Symmetry: D2
Subunit: 214 residues, 4 copies
């Protein structure tokens, strides 16, 4: 596919909607704030909308390499603060995916350029859970790192001043840590769901523990 094909398909798509689904934009037209914030990877192997069946306008979205929530990344923090304080989303979903190019590159450590600096945050995670990973079969270590990465980002987001203050003033906002694979497009709940400061700490340890078993 080339550029002209995208513009042409869009023009035809727009016209076809009139006599196939005229109310397609009805929801959009009506100022309806999203209830979910989705933080995913730029790889976007399978669109979040397709994975969940959500309609356009129901989710606010941020995507970066390897779906990271770095303590000091204002790009991501700005999306979160806007979503939590202004749009007042009720659920935040951090979703990783098996076979993520970013996660793999962080382990193999090839010389890719500027992106290597961003990826060092993942290597920090790999070092952190070294013992845990060496306790499992080799073929499952990369997929496990993918899950650990999501859990650590959920933990990071929960500790941001944004989430801490929201939960402190009693706002209802839940964080979820999910992952999916390209073999079946099945969402997998890493079970680190946090609804407040206490469950954040509890479920985090819970998630890590469920891996010690696995």
């Amino acid at each position: 596919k080339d550029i002209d094909t995208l513009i042409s398909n869009n023009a035809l798509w727009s016209k076809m909607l009139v006599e196939e689904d005229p109310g397609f934009f009805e929801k959009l037209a009506q100022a309806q704030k999203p209830r979910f914030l989705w933080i995913g990877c730029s790889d976007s192997r399978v669109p979040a909308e397709r994975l969940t069946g959500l309609e356009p306008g129901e989710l606010f979205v941020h995507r970066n390499v390897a779906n990271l929530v770095i303590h000091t990344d204002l790009n991501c923090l700005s999306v979160v603060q806007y979503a939590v304080d202004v749009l007042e989303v009720e659920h935040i979903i951090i979703c990783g995916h098996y076979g993520c190019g970013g996660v793999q590159a962080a382990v193999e450590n090839p010389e890719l350029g500027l992106i290597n600096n961003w990826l060092l945050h993942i290597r920090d995670i790999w070092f952190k859970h070294s013992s845990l990973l060496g306790e499992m079969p080799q073929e499952r270590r990369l997929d496990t790192l993918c899950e650990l990465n999501v859990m650590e980002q959920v933990y990071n987001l929960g500790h941001s001043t944004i989430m801490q203050s929201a939960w402190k003033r009693g706002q209802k906002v839940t964080i979820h840590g999910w992952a999916y694979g390209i073999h079946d497009g099945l969402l997998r709940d890493l079970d680190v769901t946090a609804t407040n400061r206490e469950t954040l700490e509890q479920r985090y340890r819970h998630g890590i523990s469920n891996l010690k078993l696995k």
Copy 2:
């Protein structure tokens, strides 16, 4: 819709694909690098995939508030460098949308919190094109700012060291500046398409000029 509904729909969606479109993941399974990098707004009113008809895996995606390409935002720059130097995408599309909450908030200047700092980059653009905007009917100024914002981000991306070096070594990478509205989902080419350092400067002025007329 609640969380349980998303997980349940996903499980059912995955199963249905087997006897409706078994080869859905065939493309994904095959390591196929995306040809397009899409930089859009976190609002994601209408998914890029739906707007263009692109299949999953064909595009690399980054989304932030008001689709900005700040000179010094490493989150966005990391996505671009990875896409250009590693995935070697051939087209980069920066797409804004009319009625963007970020653009509007930058003009009205309400006290929203941390996000206000991110939005000041848009106010800089508004000041920059003050004369141009005052030369057009009031009802069209916000939509025009939305277009100007996209053009300025295309300009910013083109001047990053990442794009400058890519074009310098003769790599084929094109940047496009688009915008769409919720009234019809029709993509609008702002005609600032840049294929090298020269066309970047030329098309930028061209885009601004086409507005002086409009």
Copy 3:
């Protein structure tokens, strides 16, 4: 000078203080919060302490290339928020200097690498005041840009959510825009001193106006 010379001189310096100025650390030992926040250039041609005669512990300091206050730079914003809200400094000084390597590089635009992205913020300023600069003798344009840069950073800092909220709750914090040259080490007040939202806007225009004359 080499590394061993610095360590050796430090050891001797420390000893000499006992029988030359025994109370040197008395001030430091006593938890005394700084009253001034100094934001300067990494070039640090002449130390701020030497320029003003301030004693150690009296100033909090941040230095980056070309003393910039980018709307979205969390490094600088973190220093400011800490200084204003926690240390409660009463004066913030942004000081540039004539002949700054960063300012010059932004104009000449040589290919220096990663730093070029940081410097684009200065080129934005150069474009912004194009008419003003072309209205003055060529030999004075670079020095004028150096002053304009400081004024714009003062403006940027004043518009951050940090300063806006501080002034809003009635906190006493003043921002100053200074510059000095290596020909005499003489501080030059650009007269853009802001004590609140109103004076920020007024003095900014004032500073620009005094240049139209110059």
Copy 4:
């Protein structure tokens, strides 16, 4: 001291130099690139120039809260890249200090606002060396964290793409990890000096080991 006193003292200081040290700016006037890059804390309890006896113009300087080198902080990375690739400094010194307000705040975890996000990078370090710290007397844990922080930042800087590429092309650049206290102003070499990729890894482990003993 107030603002008028700083401006007045500067004016008098400048004049006095003529008949006390007329050649004070001679060095500065002569375009002499610094040989050292100093990365320190914004606290700046004792100026680097006073600690080492270096003259103005001999050092390039960056200061932020708790002297951090975050993998993805473009402010700090820009200073380093400019210093290494353009100024070609030969030594980079990361210097922390005992009693650092940033380090302490990271441990006590008070609610300070935006700065708490920046400080989470230090808490990550505290968690990382939990076992090591619990193996030492309580009264020495905070000072030890101060040293561990410096060692980790040296490690971070060494792993940046900037340092990796410099050492790869055979450039001579050495990184040092120091710390000083307000009780005597005595510099303490943490002995993690790295001159290349190999010594970076070796000296890092060495530094941590010397603590296991201490």
